[PDB]
C-alpha cells in the first residue's frame, strides 16, 4: 500500500542544523496531508508541521520561525530543515499522511540536540 521512510538524524549541537526528509512510497504527497510529528520519552505525540495537497503550510508555535517544511512534487519528497535548533527539539521525529480516510506512519528518527555548552 503506502509506506512512508524518514531520514536525518543524530546528535547536532544546540544552536545548530539539521535536515530531515520522508520519502513516499504508493502515494503522492501532492494529492494529501502530510504532517510531521515529535515524541520526546514518556510524552504524548506532538505536531511540528504540516502541509496540505494545495501548499498550506502550517507550523506549532515551538517551532515557528525556525523550521521549514517543503516539499518537491517531482521527488515525491518533503523535508524538514531544522535552524537555530534548542535542546528541547530533542525527540524522535515522525513522518505521517492522510489519505482519505486512512492514516500511515512512519517509523521515526531519533534527533538529539546536546544541551547549550555541553563541554
Known amino acids: 500500500q503506502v509506506q512512508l521512510q524518514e531520514s536525518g538524524g543524530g546528535l547536532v549541537q544546540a544552536g545548530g542544523s539539521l535536515r530531515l526528509s520522508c520519502a513516499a512510497s504508493?502515494?503522492?504527497?501532492?494529492?494529501?496531508?502530510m504532517t510531521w510529528y515529535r515524541q520526546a520519552p514518556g510524552k504524548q505525540r506532538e505536531w511540528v508541521a504540516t502541509m496540505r495537497s494545495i501548499g498550506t503550510t502550517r507550523y506549532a508555535s515551538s517551532v515557528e520561525g525556525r523550521f521549514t517544511l517543503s516539499r518537491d512534487n517531482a521527488k515525491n519528497t518533503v523535508y524538514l530543515q531544522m535552524n537555530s535548533l534548542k535542546p528541547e527539539d530533542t525527540a524522535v521525529y515522525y513522518c505521517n499522511l492522510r489519505r482519505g480516510g486512512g492514516i500511515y506512519w512512519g517509523q521515526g528518527t531519533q534527533v538529539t540536540v546536546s544541551s547549550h555548552h555541553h563541554h
Open positions: 504508493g502515494s503522492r504527497f501532492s494529492s494529501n496531508t
